[PDB]
Amino acid sequence: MIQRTPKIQVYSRHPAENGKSNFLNCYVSGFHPSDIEVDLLKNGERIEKVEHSDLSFSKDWSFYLLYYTEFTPTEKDEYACRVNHVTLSQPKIVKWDRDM
Amino acid sequence: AQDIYRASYY
Amino acid sequence: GSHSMRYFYTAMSRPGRGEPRFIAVGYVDDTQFVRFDSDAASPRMAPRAPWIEQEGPEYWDRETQISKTNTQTYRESLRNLRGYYNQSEAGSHTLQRMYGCDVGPDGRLLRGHDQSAYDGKDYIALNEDLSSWTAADTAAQITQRKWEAAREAEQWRAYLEGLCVEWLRRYLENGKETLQRADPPKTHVTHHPISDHEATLRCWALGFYPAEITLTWQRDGEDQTQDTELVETRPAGDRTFQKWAAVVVPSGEEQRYTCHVQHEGLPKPLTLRWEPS
């Protein structure tokens, strides 16, 4: 039956300013079915207390979810998003890039 | 506000 | 402009894992305002926009009640379709529904909507006349015959032409600042050298609402439409949206390139160039 691979975008709420507080977003969409798991990573280890938007879906019935957390960008800390879903052979990691 | 009738069974 | 109310329902069996789960979200335009999750601490209809909080205890009771029986009846509905399609009670299945109102800028009804999918596939859809259905297959024809024969069929339609429109107009008033003032994009262009002879120009649209937006790159007069990288419009996390468009340019020639931004919150289209500094 319908199985649709998730699209992933990692990005901040506001333009990344080293030292100033912000929000790290992992937006996953275009996936079916709705069972999916995702953690944000700081330097490679999961982040505590990550909230997420309530399950919704687009006009072609694919789901979407916004995973986020408060964070503070440093010049040095690597943040990322780790996503798994039945369509994936193994958990996919998307690195955060402040320019995208 | 939701429509109660859209709790009707398929 | 036009405005829309939508309820999105997801009902997912998880055999051997738990009871079927039921989630409802409601939207006015691109703003989510209510949420219900049958797995919650104690399942309640819960607010998610400022303006919905004006609603008294009477309101949150009806919506919680409707969603509590939604939770009961959609489990029944998954069993029917399990039966309609002759399916094992072991596999997991998904039922999705959308429904609601459209009203014009003067607040007159335009359209009602009611569509459902089952395991991602279109299943049944209400027609424009709001009083007849289109079925994807013979399973959905069973549902169609039940829905069309119901003593309640007129009251189904009366919801879309009546109560649904009344609440939409109300919500649009309770949050008229929120919901009736488009926020234009804060716009930037940024420069990203690729080699010594190529740079990436990235056009940013940020903080805008509603989500609909157009970002075009123009090399001189015409549109670089086949050389433009566009990401999907995406939520900022604060009820606004972001989007960017990017093009690779000859390192010397950045000024040949303009970004064109259209959004409901912009008087006229914007045009940006890369301003080095």
Author numbering:
A (entry chain B): 0 to 99
B (entry chain C): 1 to 10
C (entry chain A): 1 to 277
Cite, word for word, the article reporting this structure.
Here, both neoantigen p/MHC samples show a clear unfolding transition with a highly reproducible Tm of 53.4°C for the nonamer and 59.3°C for the decamer complex, suggesting that the decamer forms a higher affinity complex with HLA-B*15:01. The nonamer complex crystallized in the P212121 space group at a resolution of 1.7 Å, while the decamer complex crystallized in the P6122 space group at a resolution of 2.6 Å. Generally, peptides of length greater than nine amino acids either bulge further out of the binding groove or form a “zig-zag” conformation. However, in our decamer complex structure, the peptide adopts a short 310 helical backbone conformation from Ile4 to Ala7, as confirmed by an inspection of φ/ψ backbone dihedral angles. Notably, while the N-terminal anchor residues are identical in the nonamer and decamer peptide, Tyr10 of the decamer replaces Tyr9 of the nonamer as the C-terminal anchor residue in a similar conformation. The accommodation of a longer peptide sequence within the fixed-size MHC groove is thus achieved through the formation of a more compact 310 helix for the decamer, relative to the extended nonamer backbone. In particular, in the decamer complex the HLA α2 helix undergoes a significant widening involving a 5.1 Å displacement of the Cα atom of Arg151. This movement is driven by a change in orientation of Arg151, which points toward the solvent in the nonamer versus toward the groove in the decamer complex, and the burying of Arg6 further toward the floor of the groove. Notably, the buried surface area (BSA) between HLA-B*15:01 and the decamer peptide is 1,986 Å2, relative to 800 Å2 in the nonamer structure. Our structural analysis suggests that an increase in the total number of intra-peptide hydrogen bonds and hydrophobic packing interactions, consistently with an increase in BSA brought on by the more compact 310 helical conformation, leads to an improved stability of the decamer complex, as confirmed independently by our DSF experiments.
